Design a protein around this ligand. Structure first.
Ligand SMILES: CCCNC(=O)Nc1cccc(C)n1
Ligand SMILES: CCCNC(=O)Nc1cccc(C)n1
Lengths: 198, 191
């Protein structure tokens, strides 16, 4: 039955993404091959290849589910902060990015593996796809509330995403990441407090 | 002799890749531009990417010299004004269609992530840290962790160049980007 195989193939796709996220999150992309991931998912190499043409193609789908969870957790952390003004929402969002990007799995897959496997253009495209809307919305609300000078929203959003992604990559490869994270949080908080009217 | 061959090849490659991009010019065309045989070129450079590595170093050296000249010519009177002029200088130099082609489009792809990040950090981190350190010395910027602030500003400036380079409307993207970076610097100096 075609339907049976198609349901099992959809299940196989989920099992492979779950399996690869777990093993690559622990050991890194370079240290785990597709045969080990197929065994972990409990599926044949033939079923795996039917879903993902090669190792990089499975890695792209892992990045998507991780980035989905990163954005959901940033939104959850911002809501949990109880920020009462757009300026406080921005302060909470900056703190939320340093907390989420400090998760060892996000560090390994997004900050260390993804720039290498996706390349610069591919990494930029993913970061923008997931974060540009949230960032533009925070900026737009701050401007509407009179807490931020009216200025071009998309360019400010892109530049701030670049600053924050470079901050997280610096923390990811620091000799002392705990110190790097605390010092980065201080310079970002000073910069935001210099820019915001509130 | 070695150095002379290498100089001719780097000059030739920078000229032709600057014009047409890395993908559109092969090594045999560069060897002819330099006036050396393919044999002499392969003696000096393992492959196309290895020649490109050396071309990126001399292009990054030219970028730095052009930014330092533009900053000196600006008549910046204080470290804070030097920062503002350095940001304007980066937008001008990275808007050169040749710098766009070699550094913003070709280098990330040819060198890969790790290689490209190592080069861009080696050229950008030291000038940035020095600009911050002088502003703090002059009382124009709060004393705070210098390297972390330098990495944040380099992220902002790298993204600014990439956003302008790939924009539907680069002239508009450049005007708008210059305004948001001027507001960001005035915010940093106010923090
Ligand atoms: C593979 C691309 C990873 N970059 C990414 O997720 N960027 C990001 C997301 C939310 C918030 C911020 C500041 N940055
Ligand atoms: C994507 C741009 C990479 N930056 C680079 O390659 N060099 C550089 C030089 C001076 C200043 C800056 C910001 N960068």
């Amino acid at each position: 039955k075609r339907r049976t195989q198609e349901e099992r193939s959809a299940a196989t796709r989920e099992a492979l993404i779950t399996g690869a996220r777990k093993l690559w999150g622990l050991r890194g992309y370079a240290e785990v091959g597709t045969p080990e991931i197929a065994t972990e998912a409990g599926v044949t190499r033939g079923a795996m290849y039917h879903q993902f043409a090669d190792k990089a193609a499975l890695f792209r789908d892992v990045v998507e589910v991780v980035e989905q969870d990163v954005m959901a957790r940033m939104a959850t952390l911002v809501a949990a902060s109880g920020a009462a003004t757009p300026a406080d929402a921005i302060r909470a969002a900056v703190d939320a990015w340093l907390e989420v990007s400090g998760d060892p799995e996000v560090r390994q897959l997004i900050l260390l593996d993804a720039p290498v496997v996706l390349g610069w253009a591919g990494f930029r495209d993913v970061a923008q796809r997931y974060s540009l809307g949230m960032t533009e919305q925070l900026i737009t609300e701050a401007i509407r509330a009179g807490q931020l000078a009216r200025q071009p929203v998309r360019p400010l959003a892109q530049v701030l995403i670049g600053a924050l992604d470079e901050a997280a990559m610096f923390i990811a490869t620091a000799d002392d990441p705990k110190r790097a994270r605390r010092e980065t949080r201080q310079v970002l908080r000073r910069l935001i407090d210099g820019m915001l009217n509130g």
